[PDB]
Design a protein around this ligand. Structure first.
Ligand SMILES: O=C(O)c1ccc2c(c1)CN(Cc1nc(N3CCc4ccc(Br)cc4CC3)no1)CC2
Ligand SMILES: O=C(O)c1ccc2c(c1)CN(Cc1nc(N3CCc4ccc(Br)cc4CC3)no1)CC2
Lengths: 140, 140
């Protein structure tokens, strides 16, 4: 099956976390979501105490990024980790889709919006209600 | 002169902005800070209206990142742009120094802390009072 790498802020708030779950749920229809092979707590979702070591989280993520056929990033919440994953993914020449919610009232980083080229790196603005449909449009 | 690339959150708060200025001021002693060749407003410091286009900001930053001998990043505020710049810099095999203030009460992203190798990628925790001394220690 196609290998998918999902990324979002490890400190995402309630609305962001509900959306990461809906996104990962829909991505399962199209391929293997590598990033769900370990518990969210082990990657840091419940704080430093439940997390694995920083070096292990970095190495595991770089291994998954290299195995992935497509990178899907939810870029609504500012995150060094998501940005770093996107930087490494661009340099690996990965097919990348960024999903951004303008209704958050945020302005997406010019470094992410400016990386878009309409083909291998796309940034799609969306509203919460249509995220599954947009994933279907991308992965059809 | 050695070419230095500085990066910090374009949405950094008051304390972060005072520190970026002190850092760039001290870096001038060691080399050319490429990132000050354009006004902070043009990179987005005063909002989208005064900023240049996203693609121009991305391309200008990638050109400066490739010309740089050392990348210095202040990673206290979560930022997709700073993370992305760090990802691209790692893949360009740049010498990188990240400066993080634990007194902010934040926990630095495991993707940045886990990228450290003690040599080409270092993460130094600091308190505001010693930032100039630590830059002297790094660049001596
Ligand atoms: O924000 C950071 O600085 C940061 C630091 C480390 C990591 C990353 C970011 C992202 N990496 C890739 C990745 N994202 C994800 N999802 C799904 C799991 C999940 C559940 C609940 C919450 Br609340 C947040 C999350 C995170 C998003 N699964 O894998 C993992 C390591
Ligand atoms: O946070 C982001 O998502 C993001 C988006 C775009 C850019 C970046 C980040 C960072 N890039 C490299 C860079 N940083 C900087 N400094 C100094 C200038 C300055 C003054 C005041 C404030 Br308040 C903030 C800043 C920014 C830090 N000079 O060049 C430029 C483009």
């Amino acid at each position: 099956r196609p290998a998918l790498y999902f990324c979002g802020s490890i400190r995402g708030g309630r609305e962001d976390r509900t959306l990461y779950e809906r996104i990962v749920s829909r991505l399962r229809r199209f391929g293997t979501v590598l990033t769900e092979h370990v518990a969210a707590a082990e990657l840091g979702a419940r704080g430093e105490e439940a997390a694995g070591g920083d070096r292990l989280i970095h190495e595991q993520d770089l291994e998954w990024l290299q195995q992935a056929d497509v990178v899907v990033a939810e870029v609504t919440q500012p995150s060094l980790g998501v940005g770093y994953e996107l930087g490494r993914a661009v340099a690996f020449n990965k097919r990348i889709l960024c999903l951004f919610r303008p209704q958050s009232g945020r302005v997406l980083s010019a470094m992410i919006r400016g990386a878009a080229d309409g083909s291998r790196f796309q940034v799609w603005d969306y509203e919460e209600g249509e995220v599954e449909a947009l994933l279907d449009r991308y992965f059809e």
